[PDB]
Amino acid sequence: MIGLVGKKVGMTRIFTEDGVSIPVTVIEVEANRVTQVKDLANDGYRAIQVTTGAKKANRVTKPEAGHFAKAGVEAGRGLWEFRLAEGEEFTVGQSISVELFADVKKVDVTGTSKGKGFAGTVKRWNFRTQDATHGNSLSHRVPGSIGQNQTPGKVFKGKKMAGQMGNERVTVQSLDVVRVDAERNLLLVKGAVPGATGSDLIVKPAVKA
Amino acid sequence: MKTFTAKPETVKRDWYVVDATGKTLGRLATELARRLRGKHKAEYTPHVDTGDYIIVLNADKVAVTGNKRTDKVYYHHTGHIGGIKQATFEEMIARRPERVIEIAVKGMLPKGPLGRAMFRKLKVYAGNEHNHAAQQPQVLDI
Amino acid sequence: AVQQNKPTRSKRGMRRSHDALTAVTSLSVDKTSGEKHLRHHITADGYYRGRKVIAK
RNA sequence: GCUGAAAGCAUCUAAGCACGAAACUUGCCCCGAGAUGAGUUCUCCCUGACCCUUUAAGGGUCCUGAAGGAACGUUGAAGAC
RNA sequence: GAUGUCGGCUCAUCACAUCCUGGGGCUGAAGUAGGUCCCAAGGGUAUGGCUGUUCGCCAUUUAAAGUGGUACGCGAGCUGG
RNA sequence: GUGAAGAGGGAAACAACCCAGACCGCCAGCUAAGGUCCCAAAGUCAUGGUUAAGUGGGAAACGAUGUGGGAAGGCCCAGAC
RNA sequence: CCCGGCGAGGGGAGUGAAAAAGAACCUGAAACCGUGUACGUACAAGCAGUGGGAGCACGCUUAGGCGUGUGACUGCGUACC
């Protein structure tokens, strides 16, 4: 079905009476307000635009204010879309809570991974380090050869080289749902999820199933 | 007496609609390229686009002789070392039929900035309906 | 390591298309002394937001 | 393999029909409208007055300066810049 | 009026005459396990002792430790036995 | 014989092959090799056949009720296959 | 006389036939580096030209449809020794 937008509160653990420690990620899922409904007739595809959280009035631009005003909902900190599975109906202004995850047992968590900045091949691509001794000359962490001789006479596209690492969209699949606290607007999922504390997260039912 | 040369600012272009159902691919393509380049006009100029706008309908119903419906292979390279990807005529028609006629015509047009300009005047639709009624296209039997 | 051909004056100019300097968009005017100054910086006379912070 | 003639039979094939693999196209993840074929949807802003002339996607003066953006400042689990 | 030539290291990429995994026909195919041929290149495809060695022998692993092309790939990347 | 010391046209590109030997000018005509569906100048020319393999547009011993043409022969309404 | 650090270097004034003869001084070429104007240029691939050629600007012209600059697009075209 549709997903929800939450915030990565942090990581903790849950102790079970059987004596098992479950590493969990605390996700705060406040009510998601539907800001726009898209259909085949007007948009060519079925989806719902939702918002969550709150934004300062002075920081909300007039174009953004009008979009929220049309749906009659308070301005949030962003907008996200979820496709409808041919059997879901929603109306603008509807509030979607974390209660819909009560019977999923597995979710897909998407977020922006931590940014490592400019990373070398050893860190970025797990390249093997060359000898630290035995005559090595300024080539301890250098990539080494990056191609073949005249025959190709070039470097192929997709060659693994140093560059930006992290700070990109990442999805972790098939994470168990440990607890669904509707009153506290909390969702506990076993394992770690991409991104740092306070980063936006998108939670959807597991697609692999 | 200098030979007459067409001028792009005073060249007349007409609109035509062509039905591709049951038409041989290559034989249909040659006529489209011929008219797209303006070779049928007495004022044809090699360096000026004197062709006509042509709308092609029912592109998914084009016909090919022999076993070309399953043996003709379209090759293209993505640019990566993996690279070569191929699709047969049947798959192209099922996946996106318009490219079949577009690819065929593109190969018969001249290569260069002017050739690309000529290709812009070709409109291909998979179905039997087009949204160019405002241009008053004229039926062209070819 | 070194060039095989001499780059043209055109190539040199295109590389310098990003070397142009950016002038200050505008200067702030002090409340009291009415002196032009860089925003968030004290004036040459020692004023800042009409306070006379430090002159000596 | 089924049915089935050419070839009274036989025959998986010529018409027709059903199976069949980590290959192929999808399904999963990421990028993606410079996709110059530059797409779609929602929302927001601007509703002056004259002059010149080779009189048109023309030029200029006065008034006006919106939505928004940028700049600057405090900075970030963002970052070589 | 120079195109650095073995091996190792790092990083590879393609071919299929396929080493493993996948699908099949025949078998002097009971089963298990094999033999041979056909299809298949998606992914995967040892660490050490000796020697500069590639190789090879040996020890012990693995589903398998494939065969080749790429200036016998790769010294304006390293090494210099 | 050509290149060397030879341009022009053709063979996609291709000194030596094919056509043909450039004194200069022309926005005139006829031809050679080679060509006439489009890129690209000229036949989607006419008549009678062949091919179904994209053969044409890469190749052998050898294998095969592919298919066209030709001259004979065996057995057959005493009933053949 | 003026700007400037009682600078450097300039702008006036004055001398001279001439100061664009000012001592970095007769004449003042080319490479090379700038400012201004016209035109072209951000979907287009290669010895950068050549043949064709629109548009724009400008000078003509007893409209005379020409000259000059630029060169969208297009055929051909791999420097010299």
PDB file of C-alpha atoms (C1' of nucleotides) in Angstrom, chain C residues 25, chain D residues 69-72:
ATOM      1  CA  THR C  25      26.235  44.096  -4.539  1.00  0.00           C
TER       2      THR C  25
ATOM      3  C1'   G D  69      16.040  35.093  -6.153  1.00  0.00           C
ATOM      4  C1'   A D  70      20.754  36.455  -4.779  1.00  0.00           C
ATOM      5  C1'   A D  71      23.967  38.675  -1.494  1.00  0.00           C
ATOM      6  C1'   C D  72      25.564  39.237   3.661  1.00  0.00           C
TER       7        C D  72
END
